[PDB]
Design a protein around this ligand. Structure first.
Ligand SMILES: [Cl-]
Ligand SMILES: [Cl-]
Ligand SMILES: [Zn+2]
Ligand SMILES: [Zn+2]
Lengths: 286, 274
């Protein structure tokens, strides 16, 4: 196997994926999806086009094998597959979402991950809730946001499932997920917002950790949600929000001269709090 | 982190071990030269291969059992309990082990109560709590003194069948992982231990009770390390250990010292110094 830390990537590198699971959005998303704040009307056709372009980046441009689950009109939030599963190595934790009406989304995700021959562990404890959006996996450990959607028991079950990794919790403000203001932008590199709320969470995370991470600080918390991938024969890749959406944050990502930067629009789904990480579950099948 | 260690205390075996060491059953003749080579290989794993600083105490021909240092001290974090062994004739071994642990700058607590006995072989430390076997060598008062010494950790007792120590059929094989034998006795003791603790331990069950005695270490730049008995000695138990794909497995022969009931944990005291 691999030794040392050199090179631009290999089949066991941090952020390597081979597969992605996504799910189409239903027409009912526009009116019936849950959302943290009143806001502008969702253009569902535009949201569909943006989702289609995002899937095209993962599958066509970057070469992942993409499993596209069909929309369910009775599950308006079903596009946000990250909340229903957390995958680490060959094990998939099927979560118990904090919003009870999203718990129906679990079935089809579990089916897809079984077909990919992952080891399946299910949250069934009636006292446990966990949204995948509250989970930051750094490659070395997990941080789990304690929010209105994820509680202490859910974090405990995650820690029981991925026993080989440290798990620590951090309080998250109401209406937010942990990854509403952070994500990994590269090996040992955490993208983080500049708000007092985001900085308070980062401090709690870094004081719980036995490691020192580097930071990529962006002026817009929402734009700290990005997707880092290590892609064969391409190397470090970063999907990030567009200059048209967050020009001041795009200026920061543009400094990453050793990344392949891919701007990806999410402006319509953001209206129902959908960001980049929310729309896929990434899997490394070795 | 569970299983961290920086130092080990061992003691050379005397020529007198062959005929004069205590043994629970008549059996084969001990090949003392072979036992010495096996002991040297064991010490080589701890010190040279794994990088522990090993304190090697000299043999005493008048103390035929002195190689079995585990029985005379229990070390938890910065505190050493110097035990009062159940076999009176082994109580002379205490002096030199106390001296060695003093030089390692440990806090020393001595079992001196004339009503108390405890062998270190009867003590299983899981990382979360202690289980203490009540055997022919370890009694209630000894276990109470251990609980008073390690006040940060829960302690519970479990009865052990005559002629055994608790770790004659169990030991820690990793974080939250108890290696355990399959005999009536072993499974009865395991059931009592689990009934006494809320914590759910994982089990590594082996068909040979003796092969459940192993040494787990967490070594920097290596990770999980496990010293276990060889396939030549216990092939059906080695097959169970070979399944631990995230452990660095180190087979270690102890066939000669097993004739005088000496297993893997018996021959060292492990210490984590910061
Ligand atoms: Cl667009
Ligand atoms: Cl990088
Ligand atoms: Zn989300
Ligand atoms: Zn012993």
């Amino acid at each position: 196997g691999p030794l040392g830390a050199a090179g631009l990537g290999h089949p066991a590198a941090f952020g390597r994926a081979t597969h992605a699971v996504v799910r189409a959005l239903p027409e009912s998303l526009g009116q019936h999806a849950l959302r943290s704040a009143k806001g502008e009307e969702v253009d569902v056709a535009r949201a569909e086009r943006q989702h289609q372009l995002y899937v095209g980046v993962l599958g066509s441009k970057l070469g992942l094998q993409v499993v596209e689950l069909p929309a369910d009109e009775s599950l308006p939030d079903c596009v946000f597959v990250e909340d229903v599963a957390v995958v680490c190595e060959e094990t998939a934790l099927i979560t118990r979402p904090g919003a009870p009406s999203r718990r129906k989304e679990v079935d089809m995700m579990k089916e897809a991950l079984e077909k990919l021959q992952l080891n399946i562990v299910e949250m069934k404890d009636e006292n446990a809730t966990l949204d995948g959006g509250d989970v930051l996996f750094t490659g070395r450990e997990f941080f789990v946001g304690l929010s209105k959607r994820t509680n202490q028991r859910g974090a405990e079950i995650l820690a029981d499932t991925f026993k080989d990794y440290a798990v620590s919790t951090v309080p998250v403000a109401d209406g937010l997920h942990l990854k509403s203001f952070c994500s990994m932008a590269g090996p040992n590199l955490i993208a983080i917002g500049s708000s007092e709320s985001a900085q308070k969470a980062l401090k709690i995370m870094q004081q719980m950790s036995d490691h020192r991470y580097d930071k990529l600080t962006v002026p817009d918390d929402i734009a700290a949600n990005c997707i880092y991938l290590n892609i064969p024969n391409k190397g470090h890749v970063l999907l990030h929000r567009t200059p048209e959406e967050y020009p001041e944050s795009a200026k920061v990502y543009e400094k990453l001269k050793d990344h392949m930067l891919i701007p990806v629009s999410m402006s319509e789904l953001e209206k129902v709090d959908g960001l980049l990480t929310c729309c896929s579950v990434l899997i490394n099948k070795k």
